[PDB]
Design a protein around this nucleic acid. Structure first.
Lengths: 151, 30, 100, 262, 205
RNA sequence: CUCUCGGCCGAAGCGUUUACUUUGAAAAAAUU
RNA sequence: AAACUGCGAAUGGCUCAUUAAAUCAGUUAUGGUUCCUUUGGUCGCUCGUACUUGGAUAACUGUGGUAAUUCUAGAGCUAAUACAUGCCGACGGGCGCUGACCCCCUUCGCGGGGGGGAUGCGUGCAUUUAUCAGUGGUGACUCUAGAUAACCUCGGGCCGAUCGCACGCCGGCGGCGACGACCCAUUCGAACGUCUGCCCUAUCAACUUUCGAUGGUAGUCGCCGUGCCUACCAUGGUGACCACGGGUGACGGGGAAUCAGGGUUCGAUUCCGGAGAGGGAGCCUGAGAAACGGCUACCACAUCCAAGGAAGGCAGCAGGCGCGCAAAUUA
């Protein structure tokens, strides 16, 4: 069913899947109600989260996290983990003895919700700070924009 | 004191709801 | 009945330890043979087992039922004057009093 | 540390207490109470350093535990009891009443008030919540919880409250054009009318305030205490009226006062 | 003792880090509560702040819910059949959170017959004690028989719940966490969750 | 720089994103 | 006086060994947690011997043991805001399910439409689970409040068998306080996270990953977020923008010397944060400690002895020895 790929039954804790309904409603349509919310800072909840079917407890829009604290950006560099990506933040650090700059970088592991598809290497991602979700992830993807050179 | 304070809050809530609803029909009737 | 005693080095007896020699127990509040200097502390102390044996100094023993003839320095002495009870309930219980 | 602290070093004390360096190594260390440690004036500093009835802390204790000092109408014998903004201090033996409000330099002024003004105080509303069985509560800036407030009273509004009973008697909204006093930050002690509140979601709001002399200054929303409705304060103000003079006009005023007398 | 600090583990680069302080009492871990089926034996624990944790070591009774119709009853745990974490905990019959349990179904059948007045989990022979014809086949009034008619208009439940009542023991999920609560509360499995757990149980064999 | 709803204005998309510069808030004392 | 009970002894003082994104500084977060105390709220909101409950135990009396200790044993008493047990009352009822009967209208009637109700069950604030709807709030809640079905731990959650002072009204009604108290808020914090920032070294170029390394799902433990740990999976995570390793005559800052400016050197040291109490490790009590002027081991030292045993921790104030070029009075 492309949903129950685990050894426990995956469901959204807030929605109830065992409502007692009539035969006409049974023959009408078999669509579950879906829990979603807004990451309310001028961030639009995507349609793939509202109309989707996936289950992710660490998703900003459908899971159990809240976005509070910093909001940063990065470029996607690696996408080889399961529901998390590794992004890169480049910056310039000012050495004031020389009055010059050196280029520095920080690698950041962020949680990518399944509602963001067609995320490529090099696309600009906007992440927001949440509570600790694993040992090394603290930020959660909220927006994706493509690279300006790509059509 | 519990029953007294409940009484004044009931009266004040009644007046506040009345003023709010009166403003609502006064604004919506345009 | 053998109310206790203590051995050649003065270490007392604990009731629950069933041996002839001495054992080091980690005693705390409420145990006998220890008095804590501080709330919550426990001390490792030596104590003799509860079995009576020859390797010992004194047995503390209590007469529980009197014989037929008296001991001259133990049983023939009259009862001494002692403190009366303090609670009004126990005054009533000692004297069989009513609600009025 | 292994637990909470009980000592305050004198150089680490709040600077507006105006303690000196050589009297001791310790400062009076305010008790826990309705005010923060950094935003209060303890009773020993008031009765000894400012008001000078006492010469030592032992004399402060002798004054306080003869049951002479009321704070907000309640007798306090804790010598380090944290008194703070808008708190009314009453000494019935000498017939004196005070409010702890700020100078233009950010220090608690010795502000004497009328005994009818000592009947009430103002509080800034810090939270509104509904508790069990649908009962609305507000929490003020001085740790007061009042049940059943007016439904119009919101957070950042100011309640005018009666110290005899503790109930809500009047209130003032947060609105552009109301009079306010600044209780934190670099503009501590200044008074003016609110002219613009800009909102930053997920962050601190910034309120713009205009002085009675036309000077304008901004603060955070946490630092604003609304005092009077529109233009007239609902409490007595100190000798300066919230007007921060610069160092030049303060020198000029000092020289004119020295010239006029002497 | 057991320490659940983060500084004993390696860094994100994989290098090892030196501790700058020894183990603190706010970083402690306690031995696990392997709650099992048996008569009630629970131990209270003093925890951080002087508060209380209840550590259940042997539990046999909880309360469980039909959520389709919002009815819960206090009933008995019978057996453990599935655990998504470890099958060794099924073999040891350990009660944890989200372990699949089968429980006694008598109060639920009792409420269903006292409410909807239809037989539940009954054989074709249908031999009943006279209390059951008193409950199922009482004498009622016009308004009451009418209200019962619109009550049995929709009193049809799933065939899988029927099959489990035919068997006599209901499947449920323990939703409370029992080593911290001293309770093994939960909810009766229904719907797609029920078919999931049935096919996973069958796929174990 | 503009489009909608509410009293010439307020909300909204910003205008490619920056680097740079300035302002405002906020920022223990002691020491200087 | 003593002794029981309560509180404090987790502050202060010392030192700088450790420790190199660690500590610490500035900035943010707890919408992811605990919090003695103060301050405010709540404390007849529960429908179910009290004009007062029970057993001890110190201090005291008396008999003792050991070379030895702030060691204690037996016997005779006697208290509580210690330890326990446990009501009355407010109390008349209300509300939600079950529901024997009764009443009215229409219909020729059947049938349909609407009310009153005896009887049982449950009930208040916390706990735990499931479900439903949408007072007050946020930038955003799975927030707060509401309703239903129940649960509520014997190692047990609240609903006062407590103490002083002035005494007064019509046996009943009372004013100040003190002490306790579940919960909520506040105060003082703490503890985990965010962003940015540190010296030398390539004669350290690949490291982490069986023994958790990086991520997912379910749980365990934890005050809570989390590979914190466990099970099953995926093979990931970091690195010439210098990882990993090593060193430092490295606690970090505020700060100090110099000074046209940039810089250079110093910051063990009185303020702030951290760490430690000979080295390690593990606990108890408590709101708070992995506490050392607490306890329990081992390691290294080491004190007394009747040889059986007992006690130890000056990087507190003085003082001593040692070390040294190097530092004060047992006031």
């Amino acid at each position: 069913a492309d949903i129950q790929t685990e050894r426990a039954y995956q469901k959204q804790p807030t929605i109830f899947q065992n409502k007692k309904r009539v035969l006409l409603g049974e023959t009408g349509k078999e669509k579950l109600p879906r829990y979603y919310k807004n990451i309310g800072l001028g961030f639009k909840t995507p349609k793939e989260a509202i109309e989707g079917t996936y289950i992710d407890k660490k998703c900003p829009f459908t899971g159990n996290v809240s976005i509070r604290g910093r909001i940063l950006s990065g470029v996607v560099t690696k996408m080889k983990m399961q529901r998390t990506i590794v992004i890169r933040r480049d910056y310039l650090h000012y050495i004031r003895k020389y009055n010059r700059f050196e280029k520095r970088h920080k690698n950041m592991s962020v949680h990518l919700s399944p509602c963001f598809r067609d995320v490529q290497i090099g696309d600009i991602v906007t992440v927001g700070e949440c509570r600790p979700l694993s040992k090394t992830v603290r930020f959660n993807v909220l927006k994706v924009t493509k690279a300006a050179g790509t059509k | 004191k519990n029953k007294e304070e409940a009484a004044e809050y009931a009266k004040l809530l009644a007046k506040r709801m009345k003023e709010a609803k009166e403003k609502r029909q006064e604004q919506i009737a345009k | 009945r053998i109310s206790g005693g203590n051995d050649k080095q003065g270490f007392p007896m604990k009731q629950g330890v069933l041996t002839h020699g001495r054992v080091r127990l980690l005693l705390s509040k409420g145990h006998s043979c220890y008095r804590p200097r501080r709330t919550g502390e426990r001390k490792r102390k030596s104590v003799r087992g509860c079995i009576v044996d020859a390797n010992l100094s004194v047995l503390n023993l209590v007469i529980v039922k009197k014989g037929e003839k008296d001991i001259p320095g133990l049983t023939d002495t009259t009862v001494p004057r002692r403190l009366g009870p303090k609670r009004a309930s126990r005054i009533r219980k000692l004297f069989n009093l009513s609600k009025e | 540390a292994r637990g909470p602290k009980k000592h305050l070093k004198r150089v680490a004390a709040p600077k507006h207490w105006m303690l000196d360096k050589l009297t001791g190594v310790f400062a009076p260390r305010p008790s826990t109470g309705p005010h923060k440690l950094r935003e209060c004036l303890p009773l020993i500093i008031f009765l000894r350093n400012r008001l000078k009835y006492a010469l030592t802390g032992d004399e402060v204790k002798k004054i306080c535990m003869q049951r002479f000092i009321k704070i907000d109408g309640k007798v306090r014998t804790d010598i380090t009891y944290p008194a703070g903004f808008m708190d009314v201090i009453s000494i019935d033996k000498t017939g004196e009443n005070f409010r702890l409000i700020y100078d233009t330099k950010g220090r608690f002024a010795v502000h004497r008030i009328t005994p009818e003004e000592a009947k009430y105080k103002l509080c800034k509303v810090r939270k509104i919540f509904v508790g069990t069985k649908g009962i609305p509560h507000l929490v003020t800036h001085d740790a007061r919880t009042i049940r059943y407030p007016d439904p119009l009273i919101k957070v950042n509004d100011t309640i005018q409250i009666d110290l005899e009973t503790g109930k809500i008697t009047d209130f003032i909204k947060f609105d552009t054009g109301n009079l306010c006093m600044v209780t934190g930050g670099a503009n501590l002690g200044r008074i003016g009318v609110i002219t613009n509140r800009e909102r930053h979601p997920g962050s601190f709001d910034v309120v713009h305030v205009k002085d009675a002399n036309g000077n304008s200054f901004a603060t955070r929303l946490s630092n604003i205490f609304v005092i009077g409705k529109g233009n007239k304060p609902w409490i007595s103000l100190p000798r300066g009226k919230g007007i921060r003079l610069t160092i030049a006009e303060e020198r000029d005023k000092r020289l004119a006062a020295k010239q006029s007398s002497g | 003792g057991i320490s659940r600090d983060n500084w004993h583990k390696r860094r994100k680069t994989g290098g090892k880090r030196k501790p700058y302080h020894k183990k603190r009492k706010y970083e402690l871990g306690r031995p696990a509560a392997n709650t099992k089926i048996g008569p009630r034996r629970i131990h209270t624990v003093r925890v951080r702040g002087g508060n209380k944790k209840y550590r259940a070591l042997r539990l046999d009774v909880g309360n469980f819910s039909w959520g389709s119709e919002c009815c819960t009853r206090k009933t008995r745990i019978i057996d453990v059949v599935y655990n998504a974490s470890n099958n060794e905990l099924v073999r040891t019959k350990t009660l944890v959170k989200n372990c699949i349990v089968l429980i006694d179904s008598t109060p639920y059948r009792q409420w269903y017959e006292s409410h909807y007045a239809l037989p539940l989990g009954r054989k074709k022979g249908a031999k009943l004690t006279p209390e059951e014809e008193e409950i199922l086949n009482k004498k009622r009034s016009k308004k009451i028989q009418k209200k019962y008619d619109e009550r049995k208009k929709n009193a049809k439940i799933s065939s899988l719940l029927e099959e489990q009542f035919q068997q006599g023991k209901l499947l449920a999920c323990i939703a409370s966490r029992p080593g911290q609560c001293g309770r093994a509360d939960g909810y009766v499995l229904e719907g797609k969750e029920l078919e999931f757990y049935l096919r996973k149980i069958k796929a174990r064999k």
